[PDB]
């Protein structure tokens, strides 16, 4: 199926408590495979997935260098961001970055990203054309002029179209046993009386991967969108995820409701009900 690789930067300043902490994590779909922490004893890129360990020693050193240089780049970016917003040097601030590429089954570039955020708000982002930028304000505009001058988009496009997809393609092969395996969810409905007139029906989905999934409750065939309680998908801790959709139905009308499940690990969308 489709796949994606993404890198996430987190540069948090901490006034009076040392230099800003820089963190990097690489993900392939919903799996984490690399991590860099400027706070670690020996700051360097470390493997987080079995299939990445087989990379040559040059790999790990090349990657660790990038992150080290980036540690400085973004620490400088945090200082620069302070001036752009006329902010004090006594407050803590955060810069976030998430970029990467998406590919279809044929492993071809589908889309590319590179977004930067400051204190949670959008700052600047590379447009889908991979050649133009979008500045959220006059401050990010300054950064845009710099990036256009230093031909940054050009460099990113090159990566996004070359190395990004190439390395991802290689990663998918080495970890095909897991990265290319979709585990369907395990489902069941629970019955929990709320009163003498209403009861709660909860549709569960467990041990599935990837995280993407769709749970819906239907009343006589009608989706109970604005009526269903849908908890945020959560990680089980074993690479798989969990999620449930609940709906309060009148007692004696439980058979008028049906739960629908959609996951790429299932050949056909599922449908279940309360099983007394």
């Amino acid at each position: 199926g489709s796949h994606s690789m993404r890198y996430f930067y987190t540069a948090m300043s901490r006034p009076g408590r040392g230099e800003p902490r820089f963190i990097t994590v690489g993900y392939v779909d919903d799996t984490l495979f690399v991590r860099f922490d400027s706070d670690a004893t020996s700051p360097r890129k470390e493997p987080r997935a079995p299939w990445i360990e087989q990379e040559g020693p040059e790999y790990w050193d090349r990657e660790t260098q990038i992150s080290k240089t980036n540690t400085q780049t973004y620490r400088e970016n945090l200082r620069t961001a302070l001036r752009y917003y006329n902010q004090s040097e006594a407050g803590s601030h955060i810069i976030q970055r998430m970029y990467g590429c998406d590919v279809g089954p044929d492993g071809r570039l589908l889309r590319g990203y590179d977004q930067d955020a400051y204190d949670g708000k959008d700052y600047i982002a590379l447009n889908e054309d991979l050649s133009s930028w979008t500045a959220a304000d006059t401050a990010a505009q300054i950064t845009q002029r710099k990036w256009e001058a230093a031909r940054v988009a050009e460099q990113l496009r090159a990566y996004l179209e070359g190395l990004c997809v190439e390395s991802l393609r290689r990663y998918l092969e080495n970890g095909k046993e897991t990265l290319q395996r979709a585990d369907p969810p395990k489902t069941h409905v629970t019955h929990h009386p709320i009163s003498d007139h209403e009861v709660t029906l909860r549709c569960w989905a467990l041990g599935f991967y990837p995280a993407e999934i769709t749970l819906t409750w239907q009343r006589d065939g009608e989706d109970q969108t604005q009526d269903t309680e849908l908890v945020e998908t959560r990680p089980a801790g074993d690479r798989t995820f969990q999620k449930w959709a609940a709906v309060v139905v009148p007692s004696g009308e439980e058979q008028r409701y049906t739960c629908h499940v959609q996951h790429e690990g299932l050949p056909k969308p599922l449908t279940l009900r309360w099983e007394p």
């Binding site: 790999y59 780049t73 710099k146 230093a150």
Partner: peptide, 9 residues
């Protein structure tokens, strides 16, 4: 793999 590419604000 990450690219080099330096992005100074």
């Amino acid at each position: 793999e990450e690219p080099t590419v330096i992005k100074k604000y």
